[PDB]
Amino acid sequence: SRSQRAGLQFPVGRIHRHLKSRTTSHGRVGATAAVYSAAILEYLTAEVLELAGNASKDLKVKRITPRHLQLAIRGDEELDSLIKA
Amino acid sequence: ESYSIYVYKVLKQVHPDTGISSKAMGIMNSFVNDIFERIAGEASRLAHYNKRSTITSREIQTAVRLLLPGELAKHAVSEGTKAVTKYTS
Amino acid sequence: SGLLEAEEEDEFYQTTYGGFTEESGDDEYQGDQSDTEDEVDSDFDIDE
Incomplete structure (x- = not known):
C-alpha cells in the first residue's frame, strides 16, 4: 500500500484519485503531489488531534469531541486562521 | 470518499490511546476534506495557469506556502517534502 | 491568546462542520x- 510507503496513515492512492477528479482539462497530478497532499493532510490532522486529545485543562481528552476540536483549532490560532481561510 | 479509518490511524499515531466519537470524526472528515480541496484546487490552478498539465511537489508545496498561515505552512511544506521523498524513494 | 478569542464571539466555529x-x-x-x-x-x- 502506497500509504505506508509514504509513512502516511492516509491513503495517497485514493487521495490521488480525488486529485485527478479535481484537476483541469488534461490536468494531471504527479505522484509527488499525491503524497505531498496526503502528508500535509496527515500532519494537519496529527496536530489537530494532538491538541484535541490535549484540548482540555488536564491536557488529555478521553474521547475527542467537536468541542475538543474547536479548542484544538481555535487555541491553535495558526489552525484558527487556516480553517477560517 | 472515506478517510475516517485513516483519521483514526493518525489519531493513534499522535495518540495511540485516544478514542473519538462519530460526529467528531465527521468534523475531522469535513476539515481534512476542505483542506484537501483547498490544496488540490490551488495546485490545479497553478497547473492550469502554467503550461504544467501536471500537479507535482512544486504545485502542492507552493499551494501549501500560499494558503497556510506561517509556521503551519512551514510544517506542512516540510511534511509534504518528507513524504514525497519517502514515496518516491 | 486563549482568552482573547473567547471574549469575542466564535460564530464561525459555531457553524463549522x-x-x-x-x-x-x-x-x-x-x-x-x-x-x-x-x-x-x-x-x-506517471512521470512528472
Missing part, C-alpha cells in the same frame, strides 16, 4: 462502511 459544540447521540466511531482499504487507478506512477 456541523458545529463544534458537544451533542448527544455521538457514538464512539465504530469503523468503516466496508471501504477502509486504500485504492488507486492506473496513472499514479
